[PDB]
Tab-separated table of C-alpha atoms and ligand atoms in Angstrom:
chain	number	residue	atom	x	y	z
A	1	UNK	CA	166.616	52.757	73.951
A	2	UNK	CA	165.370	52.389	77.777
A	3	UNK	CA	162.158	49.548	78.860
A	4	UNK	CA	160.422	49.602	81.901
A	5	UNK	CA	158.216	46.864	83.236
A	6	UNK	CA	156.223	46.130	85.914
A	7	UNK	CA	156.784	42.662	87.918
A	8	UNK	CA	153.772	41.255	90.228
A	9	UNK	CA	154.160	38.816	93.074
A	10	UNK	CA	152.383	35.246	91.903
A	11	UNK	CA	150.971	34.701	95.250
A	12	UNK	CA	150.546	36.295	98.926
A	13	UNK	CA	153.964	35.157	99.959
A	14	UNK	CA	155.771	36.637	97.282
A	15	UNK	CA	156.973	33.241	95.819
A	16	UNK	CA	158.083	34.496	92.607
A	17	UNK	CA	157.399	37.406	90.417
A	18	UNK	CA	155.898	37.541	86.890
A	19	UNK	CA	156.306	40.145	84.657
A	20	UNK	CA	154.718	40.611	80.999
A	21	UNK	CA	156.581	39.975	77.533
A	22	UNK	CA	155.411	40.240	73.898
A	23	UNK	CA	156.520	37.814	71.925
A	24	UNK	CA	156.123	37.615	68.002
A	25	UNK	CA	153.931	39.468	65.503
A	26	UNK	CA	150.961	40.215	66.480
A	27	UNK	CA	151.919	39.655	69.900
A	28	UNK	CA	151.247	37.028	72.419
A	29	UNK	CA	151.912	38.474	75.810
A	30	UNK	CA	153.121	35.577	78.117
A	31	UNK	CA	154.207	36.620	81.990
A	32	UNK	CA	157.549	35.223	82.374
A	33	UNK	CA	160.095	34.946	85.360
A	34	UNK	CA	162.815	37.161	85.183
A	35	UNK	CA	165.463	35.062	86.462
A	36	UNK	CA	168.986	36.519	86.609
A	37	UNK	CA	170.285	33.294	88.244
A	38	UNK	CA	169.605	31.425	84.503
A	39	UNK	CA	170.375	32.212	80.859
A	40	UNK	CA	167.623	31.107	78.508
A	41	UNK	CA	164.222	32.558	78.050
A	42	UNK	CA	161.931	29.561	77.719
A	43	UNK	CA	158.261	29.521	77.386
A	44	UNK	CA	155.103	26.897	77.588
A	45	UNK	CA	154.125	26.670	73.797
A	46	UNK	CA	152.218	25.010	71.364
A	47	UNK	CA	154.572	22.179	71.645
A	48	UNK	CA	154.360	21.375	74.971
A	49	UNK	CA	152.987	17.950	76.024
A	50	UNK	CA	149.355	18.573	76.476
A	51	UNK	CA	149.455	16.597	79.602
A	52	UNK	CA	151.936	19.221	80.957
A	53	UNK	CA	149.939	22.401	80.506
A	54	UNK	CA	147.475	23.369	83.108
A	55	UNK	CA	146.325	26.780	82.882
A	56	UNK	CA	149.678	28.561	81.585
A	57	UNK	CA	149.334	30.665	78.372
A	58	UNK	CA	151.268	29.644	75.319
A	59	UNK	CA	153.346	30.822	72.772
A	60	UNK	CA	152.413	29.599	69.193
A	61	UNK	CA	155.004	30.293	66.685
A	62	UNK	CA	152.831	29.034	63.819
A	63	UNK	CA	151.084	32.268	64.935
A	64	UNK	CA	153.690	34.632	64.878
A	65	UNK	CA	154.343	36.026	61.110
A	66	UNK	CA	158.098	36.570	62.622
A	67	UNK	CA	159.069	33.437	63.838
A	68	UNK	CA	161.573	31.555	62.413
A	69	UNK	CA	162.284	27.563	63.406
A	70	UNK	CA	166.040	27.967	64.582
A	71	UNK	CA	167.111	24.978	62.803
A	72	UNK	CA	168.869	21.965	64.868
A	73	UNK	CA	168.559	23.994	68.012
A	74	UNK	CA	167.840	22.302	71.063
A	75	UNK	CA	167.901	23.179	74.668
A	76	UNK	CA	167.598	21.289	78.272
A	77	UNK	CA	167.766	23.011	81.718
A	78	UNK	CA	167.788	22.155	85.122
A	79	UNK	CA	167.516	24.531	88.197
A	80	UNK	CA	168.656	24.433	91.377
A	81	UNK	CA	165.314	23.571	92.794
A	82	UNK	CA	165.302	20.351	90.891
A	83	UNK	CA	162.821	21.498	88.346
A	84	UNK	CA	163.456	21.158	84.268
A	85	UNK	CA	162.263	21.647	81.317
A	86	UNK	CA	163.615	21.082	77.329
A	87	UNK	CA	162.923	21.657	73.727
A	88	UNK	CA	163.395	23.244	70.386
A	89	UNK	CA	164.172	26.885	69.525
A	90	UNK	CA	162.551	29.929	67.410
A	91	UNK	CA	163.853	33.303	66.769
A	92	UNK	CA	160.896	36.257	67.064
A	93	UNK	CA	160.548	39.338	68.273
A	94	UNK	CA	160.738	39.760	72.032
A	95	UNK	CA	159.943	43.250	74.172
A	96	UNK	CA	159.561	44.074	77.472
A	97	UNK	CA	158.245	47.374	78.694
A	98	UNK	CA	158.498	49.198	75.546
A	99	UNK	CA	162.166	47.802	74.633
A	100	UNK	CA	162.154	45.533	71.247
A	101	UNK	CA	164.956	43.059	70.278
A	102	UNK	CA	164.323	41.172	66.851
A	103	UNK	CA	165.923	37.781	66.805
A	104	UNK	CA	165.670	36.729	70.071
A	105	UNK	CA	166.175	32.867	70.954
A	106	UNK	CA	162.681	31.959	72.422
A	107	UNK	CA	163.308	28.449	73.510
A	108	UNK	CA	160.004	26.251	72.555
A	109	UNK	CA	159.186	23.688	75.716
A	110	UNK	CA	158.278	20.431	74.572
A	111	UNK	CA	158.208	19.033	77.901
A	112	UNK	CA	158.605	20.773	81.768
A	113	UNK	CA	158.776	19.154	85.078
A	114	UNK	CA	155.931	18.738	87.357
A	115	UNK	CA	156.524	22.014	89.424
A	116	UNK	CA	156.224	24.043	86.528
A	117	UNK	CA	152.631	22.712	85.200
A	118	UNK	CA	151.876	23.063	88.743
A	119	UNK	CA	152.047	26.525	88.513
A	120	UNK	CA	149.505	28.157	86.611
A	121	UNK	CA	151.123	31.830	86.861
A	122	UNK	CA	154.278	31.435	85.354
A	123	UNK	CA	154.445	30.979	81.578
A	124	UNK	CA	158.212	30.543	81.258
A	125	UNK	CA	161.465	32.198	82.607
A	126	UNK	CA	163.496	34.893	81.056
A	127	UNK	CA	167.108	34.755	81.947
A	128	UNK	CA	169.320	37.289	82.734
A	129	UNK	CA	172.607	36.119	84.117
A	130	UNK	CA	175.364	35.904	81.862
A	131	UNK	CA	174.975	34.080	78.011
A	132	UNK	CA	177.647	31.918	78.883
A	133	UNK	CA	175.053	29.892	80.844
A	134	UNK	CA	172.714	29.585	78.033
A	135	UNK	CA	171.898	25.840	77.338
A	136	UNK	CA	171.077	26.030	73.308
A	137	UNK	CA	173.330	23.788	71.166
A	138	UNK	CA	174.857	23.172	69.093
A	139	UNK	CA	175.003	26.463	69.182
A	140	UNK	CA	174.850	28.674	72.341
A	141	UNK	CA	172.229	31.917	72.040
A	142	UNK	CA	171.897	35.252	73.812
A	143	UNK	CA	169.973	36.558	76.439
A	144	UNK	CA	167.524	38.981	76.010
A	145	UNK	CA	169.536	41.604	77.730
A	146	UNK	CA	172.702	40.595	76.060
A	147	UNK	CA	170.843	41.354	72.841
A	148	UNK	CA	169.926	44.192	73.821
A	149	UNK	CA	172.662	45.949	75.355
A	150	UNK	CA	174.144	47.719	72.965
A	151	UNK	CA	171.433	49.647	71.805
A	152	UNK	CA	170.477	50.661	75.844
A	153	UNK	CA	171.287	54.347	76.734
A	154	UNK	CA	173.292	52.633	79.587
A	155	UNK	CA	174.121	48.897	79.522
A	156	UNK	CA	172.209	48.129	83.051
A	157	UNK	CA	169.093	46.922	83.937
A	158	UNK	CA	167.476	47.211	87.530
A	159	UNK	CA	165.506	45.263	89.966
A	160	UNK	CA	163.004	46.983	92.390
A	161	UNK	CA	161.073	44.106	93.609
A	162	UNK	CA	158.182	44.581	96.371
A	163	UNK	CA	157.067	43.063	99.500
A	164	UNK	CA	153.658	41.937	99.032
A	165	UNK	CA	153.497	44.156	96.108
A	166	UNK	CA	154.489	44.771	92.330
A	167	UNK	CA	157.997	46.447	91.704
A	168	UNK	CA	159.461	47.310	88.584
A	169	UNK	CA	162.446	45.662	86.157
A	170	UNK	CA	164.012	48.720	83.971
A	171	UNK	CA	166.538	48.059	81.334
A	172	UNK	CA	168.980	51.172	79.943
A	173	UNK	CA	168.648	53.383	83.202
A	174	UNK	CA	168.715	54.400	86.370
A	175	UNK	CA	165.614	55.475	88.185
A	176	UNK	CA	166.508	57.930	90.884
A	177	UNK	CA	163.767	58.589	92.298
A	178	UNK	CA	163.597	54.571	93.129
A	179	UNK	CA	165.613	54.525	96.207
A	180	UNK	CA	167.043	56.731	99.027
A	181	UNK	CA	170.465	57.522	99.531
A	182	UNK	CA	173.107	56.439	97.084
A	183	UNK	CA	174.084	53.246	95.612
A	184	UNK	CA	177.154	51.200	96.293
A	185	UNK	CA	178.532	49.486	93.853
A	186	UNK	CA	180.649	45.947	94.380
A	187	UNK	CA	182.892	43.802	92.034
A	188	UNK	CA	181.088	41.150	90.217
A	189	UNK	CA	182.975	37.614	88.987
A	190	UNK	CA	181.420	36.344	85.860
A	191	UNK	CA	183.236	32.922	86.048
A	192	UNK	CA	180.653	31.028	86.959
A	193	UNK	CA	177.744	32.700	84.697
A	194	UNK	CA	176.089	34.349	87.668
A	195	UNK	CA	176.007	37.958	89.175
A	196	UNK	CA	178.458	36.505	91.787
A	197	UNK	CA	179.805	39.051	94.038
A	198	UNK	CA	181.272	39.326	98.037
A	199	UNK	CA	179.045	40.254	100.893
A	200	UNK	CA	180.986	41.993	103.475
A	201	UNK	CA	179.209	40.771	106.544
A	202	UNK	CA	175.478	40.664	108.126
A	203	UNK	CA	173.496	41.554	111.489
A	204	UNK	CA	170.750	39.655	112.983
A	205	UNK	CA	168.333	42.485	114.458
A	206	UNK	CA	169.769	45.144	116.640
A	207	UNK	CA	172.851	43.235	116.951
A	208	UNK	CA	176.336	44.365	116.397
A	209	UNK	CA	177.814	43.703	112.687
A	210	UNK	CA	180.228	40.889	111.938
A	211	UNK	CA	182.558	41.456	109.508
A	212	UNK	CA	183.052	38.277	107.362
A	213	UNK	CA	183.225	37.926	103.245
A	214	UNK	CA	179.995	35.909	102.182
A	215	UNK	CA	180.504	34.820	98.057
A	216	UNK	CA	176.931	34.470	96.748
A	217	UNK	CA	175.276	35.404	93.842
A	218	UNK	CA	171.941	37.721	93.089
A	219	UNK	CA	169.807	35.931	91.944
A	220	UNK	CA	166.144	37.117	91.135
A	221	UNK	CA	164.764	33.633	90.460
A	222	UNK	CA	165.207	31.940	93.696
A	223	UNK	CA	162.868	33.111	96.542
A	224	UNK	CA	165.079	32.521	99.689
A	225	UNK	CA	168.143	33.870	100.906
A	226	UNK	CA	170.334	31.135	101.309
A	227	UNK	CA	173.816	31.706	103.338
A	228	UNK	CA	176.132	29.469	105.580
A	229	UNK	CA	175.134	27.181	107.747
A	230	UNK	CA	176.738	29.509	110.483
A	231	UNK	CA	174.917	32.717	109.424
A	232	UNK	CA	171.431	30.924	109.677
A	233	UNK	CA	172.072	29.290	112.913
A	234	UNK	CA	172.833	32.747	114.702
A	235	UNK	CA	169.751	34.589	112.755
A	236	UNK	CA	167.276	31.563	114.335
A	237	UNK	CA	168.638	31.095	117.389
A	238	UNK	CA	167.089	34.696	118.090
A	239	UNK	CA	163.928	33.373	117.496
A	240	UNK	CA	162.487	31.331	120.737
A	241	UNK	CA	161.368	27.888	119.513
A	242	UNK	CA	162.977	27.983	115.428
A	243	UNK	CA	164.549	25.008	114.666
A	244	UNK	CA	165.867	23.268	111.741
A	245	UNK	CA	163.645	20.374	110.746
A	246	UNK	CA	164.956	17.795	108.538
A	247	UNK	CA	161.614	16.338	107.852
A	248	UNK	CA	160.333	19.752	106.458
A	249	UNK	CA	163.477	20.879	104.825
A	250	UNK	CA	164.580	23.716	106.554
A	251	UNK	CA	164.413	26.441	109.453
A	252	UNK	CA	160.630	26.745	110.695
A	253	UNK	CA	159.471	28.725	113.712
A	254	UNK	CA	156.600	29.451	115.703
A	255	UNK	CA	153.915	31.449	113.890
A	256	UNK	CA	153.652	33.459	116.694
A	257	UNK	CA	156.851	34.742	116.739
A	258	UNK	CA	158.118	38.329	116.263
A	259	UNK	CA	160.854	37.871	113.651
A	260	UNK	CA	163.719	40.156	113.829
A	261	UNK	CA	165.627	41.863	110.838
A	262	UNK	CA	168.659	40.871	109.017
A	263	UNK	CA	171.278	43.201	107.598
A	264	UNK	CA	173.618	42.341	104.870
A	265	UNK	CA	176.819	44.356	104.009
A	266	UNK	CA	177.651	45.710	100.523
A	267	UNK	CA	181.069	47.388	100.858
A	268	UNK	CA	180.772	49.667	103.516
A	269	UNK	CA	177.016	50.156	102.953
A	270	UNK	CA	173.866	47.817	104.747
A	271	UNK	CA	170.685	46.762	103.373
A	272	UNK	CA	168.259	45.818	105.943
A	273	UNK	CA	165.804	42.867	105.645
A	274	UNK	CA	162.744	43.708	107.884
A	275	UNK	CA	161.611	40.343	109.889
A	276	UNK	CA	158.326	40.536	108.201
A	277	UNK	CA	160.361	39.425	104.921
A	278	UNK	CA	161.605	36.412	106.468
A	279	UNK	CA	158.230	34.868	107.148
A	280	UNK	CA	157.082	32.363	104.482
A	281	UNK	CA	153.865	31.258	106.242
A	282	UNK	CA	152.609	28.136	107.552
A	283	UNK	CA	154.340	24.909	106.447
A	284	UNK	CA	151.274	23.655	105.539
A	285	UNK	CA	147.389	25.414	105.543
A	286	UNK	CA	146.817	25.611	109.185
A	287	UNK	CA	149.479	25.237	110.937
A	288	UNK	CA	151.384	26.857	113.673
A	289	UNK	CA	154.488	25.763	112.273
A	290	UNK	CA	156.106	28.796	109.657
A	291	UNK	CA	158.326	28.315	107.080
A	292	UNK	CA	161.677	30.780	107.361
A	293	UNK	CA	163.046	32.476	104.862
A	294	UNK	CA	166.972	32.788	105.461
A	295	UNK	CA	167.755	29.014	104.885
A	296	UNK	CA	171.155	27.317	104.544
A	297	UNK	CA	172.853	27.162	101.674
A	298	UNK	CA	174.824	24.032	102.729
A	299	UNK	CA	174.779	21.246	100.357
A	300	UNK	CA	173.522	23.883	97.303
A	301	UNK	CA	177.404	24.892	96.848
A	302	UNK	CA	176.805	28.564	96.438
A	303	UNK	CA	175.032	31.164	98.285
A	304	UNK	CA	172.369	32.793	96.708
A	305	UNK	CA	170.841	36.468	97.530
A	306	UNK	CA	167.317	35.534	96.639
A	307	UNK	CA	164.255	37.763	96.470
A	308	UNK	CA	164.308	37.684	100.504
A	309	UNK	CA	167.311	40.047	100.093
A	310	UNK	CA	166.787	41.685	96.646
A	311	UNK	CA	163.422	42.790	97.715
A	312	UNK	CA	164.919	45.047	100.113
A	313	UNK	CA	166.562	46.736	97.856
A	314	UNK	CA	167.067	48.679	94.583
A	315	UNK	CA	169.716	46.813	92.610
A	316	UNK	CA	171.948	47.636	89.520
A	317	UNK	CA	173.149	44.800	87.164
A	318	UNK	CA	175.745	46.721	85.288
A	319	UNK	CA	176.498	45.138	82.327
A	320	UNK	CA	179.334	47.396	81.319
A	321	UNK	CA	182.547	45.711	79.827
A	322	UNK	CA	183.490	44.825	83.662
A	323	UNK	CA	180.106	44.181	85.323
A	324	UNK	CA	179.208	45.135	88.939
A	325	UNK	CA	176.468	45.050	91.087
A	326	UNK	CA	174.735	48.023	92.581
A	327	UNK	CA	172.535	48.202	95.996
A	328	UNK	CA	170.807	50.664	97.378
A	329	UNK	CA	168.012	50.924	100.206
A	330	UNK	CA	164.452	52.226	99.445
B	401	NA	NA1	158.551	25.951	100.285
């Protein structure tokens, strides 16, 4: 089998991407944030504290003839950005882009943190990291991909995120028309539960490539590119007036600037992030200070190749017995 679904930016900055997901019978379609940095499929629901729901579409398990309580199971998650959610668990039929999994764990939120409430466009998350990170207790549950894997034509999914435009998540096949040149594959460590890999270096603009190993995670659920402070300083030094602002919480730059590109290495190959991809706009409405899309990972404890990086590439998440990642230009 295969599946293919379009993923759509939630706003004009590409702060996140939402993908429609069919849950239950008859289908209830929710727009979920596909997150290769976590491993829980959780949704706003008829169980979510009423004051914590503000415009989201909810899953109502009592209206699904295929829903079944997963008795005794609970979940609770906290994300790198400080947000969180928790609740109980149902199994139900879940379909993405025509690919169906029966008996998928659907984690129903009883509580969500304010950042989720405040974002009316995201109805929940669909985790695509390794199932070892799934938070359900006392019986850990499998991700949608892990459940689908054996049935897929090939045990892979691909992320093709757009810049200020929709893109595509495919399951079970490589669309050879979706990228240019060849795909370069690179090794993955699953020891921390992530799609963790090692970039071979970077360049700023038209500058020389610096060969240096940068361990990090491929994370579709993180907006920005988080790299070591040395690398990030080298980038922003090429933008007149850019500076790290402790009060704003990262690098800012004059909105009048023209941003240079940023290149990262994948083996001997190179992925170029255009400068425009690094602009996250005014820090507040009407400000002439703009927020940068490349930020320091110092304090986070891991480097994160978030959407800023991933949307410059066609990315293969190869879930074979020994997983690997692939990157192509597009
Ligand atoms: Na922000």
